[PDB]
Design a binder for this molecule. Structure first.
Ligand SMILES: [Cl-]
Length: 595
């Protein structure tokens, strides 16, 4: 057992019996100065000699939150010779000249002057003769490989009276001081990847961000991160892992320390940069707002948009109601309400819980709008909601989507100068204009093959824009729009596919934006995956920022517009999960987001 580490007080059982056993090792025979039965391990607690394992145990238990102590164990040098642990080792002369060297020390370093002075002569490569300088008697021949002798210990055995010399057993030097730090705290040893993938924090990564906002100060320790130059100059003799300790603390609370490392030095340097931002409270360059489902992602957008009790209303749509939802963006932005989601036959607890949080104590003066028919949100969920006590659960709906959009449209203030027209089958093209519309009170009118009379009545006199190709919004509807348009002109934003449409909306409206949001485009798992995009559009509207729609890599058309329009973006916010890291990297690269 040989190493210096840290354990928590709670999991220190193993160290304590480790010490109990080591305290039993004693010297059975000593020749270099120790005492028989002396312990062979020198063990201390904050440099105080350990009386027994139970005092270790009591010191560890008396540690309050955050406090730590160190145990030092050091072998004083021992070995087993013939079944007995000893403090000594037998050393032998290794060359002829070692022998004469010893004689020289005894003569000058010990004796001095002359009387007991000895003399040695090398006689061959591995024998030296030793005798006295005066009488030249008491002659011995030492060979290389013979045990060291003490010339101060003459063996005058009185069987008459003769000479002789005794041996020098030597000390086994102390080995090395190992330290175990014991902390009353929660400790973790994890790879850096578990917390951060290269550009985004992971869900485990955001738990730390959440603890800081919860009064935990973030502090760093044992920082052993190498600069690109220490990695550039492959001078050898360098570690294969970067590391550091993250410490979270709060008053009356038990701290927590998380040790991270990786074979990826850039990952670690990068992660340490994001955590400095989290500790400094400085807005990150890449933030993910998401949960394990469309319902928990919708709550995370709501937490970003509203502090407790700050929402004036609730917009509730069916979980799969993409058209009612994307059309609901200027409505959620206008009524300062989150777009939350319901099952048709129930309200998940996560959403009910976010309703309470954002309406707060004055819910009595606020409203809950349910968009869509009972085919999206049943009559029964509507009555469970009437049990709350909000000013009013008002349903905004019609016989179909076309009709529902005009109803949403009517809940907006008529003081708007812009309106958008999209097809009942164009949700993947349409979603691209939700933030812009939410950002300007512009309704989003959804139409079938021919424009309804009420639709024409709401847009007659205002400036209109079409989003979708002629197969979504017929060229006939277009002709009727140019007719009711103010300047007798209606532009159409329409790419070959939904990523080209998203690129045209971004090219047209977002020059100068200081943020970019990104969400799945519906190409993995179908159009229902556009729900993330629709819960975030009022959020992107509040930031005057666009939503890039992508699941895998950007199209070239998107890559080019981002490069022209979003050079001022100083933040990339990802909504939801399942977006390739490469598209986020591509986006970061084009807008020059880093360093
Ligand atoms: Cl994040």
């Amino acid at each position: 057992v040989d190493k210096n580490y840290t354990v928590s007080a709670k999991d220190s059982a193993k160290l304590i019996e480790e010490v109990r056993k080591a305290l039993e090792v004693k010297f059975e025979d000593t020749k270099a100065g120790a005492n028989v039965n002396d312990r062979v391990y020198d063990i201390k607690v904050d440099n105080v000699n350990l009386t027994n394992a139970t005092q270790l145990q009591n010191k560890i238990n008396s540690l309050t939150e955050g406090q730590s102590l160190k145990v030092t164990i050091q072998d004083k040098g021992h070995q087993v010779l013939g079944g007995k642990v000893v403090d000594y080792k037998i050393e032998n002369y290794k060359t002829a000249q070692e022998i004469v060297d010893a004689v020289n020390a005894y003569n000058a370093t010990l004796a001095e002057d002359s009387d007991n002075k000895l003399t040695a002569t090398i006689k061959s490569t591995n024998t030296v003769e030793v005798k006295r300088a005066k009488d030249s008697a008491n002659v011995i021949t030492l060979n290389v490989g013979d045990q060291h002798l003490d010339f101060s210990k003459v063996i005058t055995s009185e069987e008459g009276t003769f000479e002789g010399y005794e041996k020098r057993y030597s000390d086994i030097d102390s080995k090395e001081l190992h330290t175990v730090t014991v902390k009353n705290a929660d400790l973790q040893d994890i790879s850096a990847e578990e917390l951060f993938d290269g550009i985004r924090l992971t869900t485990l990564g955001r738990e730390i961000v959440n603890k800081v906002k919860n009064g935990y100060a973030l502090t760093f320790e044992n920082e052993a991160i190498l600069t690109q130059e220490q990695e550039d100059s492959d001078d050898k003799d360098k570690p294969e892992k970067s590391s550091f300790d993250i410490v979270l603390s709060k008053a009356n609370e038990k701290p927590e320390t998380i040790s991270v490392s990786s074979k990826n030095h850039k990952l670690v340097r990068d992660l340490h940069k994001v955590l400095t931002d989290v500790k400094d409270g400085k807005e990150l360059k890449v933030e993910v707002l998401s949960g394990d489902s469309r319902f928990t992602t919708a709550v995370e957008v709501s937490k970003e948009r509203f502090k407790d009790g700050e929402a004036e209303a609730i917009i509730l749509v069916g979980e799969d109601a993409i058209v009612d939802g994307l059309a609901s963006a200027p409505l959620a932005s206008q009524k300062n309400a989150p777009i939350l989601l319901s099952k048709k036959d129930s309200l998940p607890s996560e959403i009910e819980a976010e309703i309470l949080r954002v309406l707060g104590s004055n819910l009595s003066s606020k409203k809950i709008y349910i968009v869509g028919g009972e085919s999206k949100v049943s009559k029964e969920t509507e009555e469970k909601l009437s049990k709350l006590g909000v000013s009013k659960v008002e349903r905004v709906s019609g016989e179909d989507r076309f009709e529902t959009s005009l109803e949403i449209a009517k809940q907006l203030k008529d003081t708007f100068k812009t309106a958008f027209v999209v097809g009942g089958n164009g949700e993947a093209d349409a979603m691209s204009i939700s933030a812009r519309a939410a950002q300007f009170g512009a309704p989003i009118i959804v139409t079938g093959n021919e424009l309804d009379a009420n639709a024409e009545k709401l847009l007659k006199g205002k400036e209109l824009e079409i989003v979708g190709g002629e197969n979504s919004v017929s060229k006939e509807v277009e002709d009727k729009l140019v007719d009711i348009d103010l300047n007798n002109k209606v532009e159409r934003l329409a790419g070959e596919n939904r990523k080209d449409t998203n690129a045209k909306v971004i090219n047209k409206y977002y020059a100068g934006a200081t943020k970019a949001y990104v969400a799945k485009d519906g190409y993995v798992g179908g159009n229902g995956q556009l729900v993330d995009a629709l819960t975030a559009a009022p959020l992107a509207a509040s930031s005057k920022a666009p939503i890039v729609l992508t699941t895998e890599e950007l199209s070239k058309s998107q890559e080019e517009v981002v490069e022209l329009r979003l050079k001022n973006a100083t933040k990339l916010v990802q909504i939801g999960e399942g977006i390739a890291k490469n598209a986020i990297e591509k986006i970061a690269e084009k807008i020059n987001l880093f360093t």
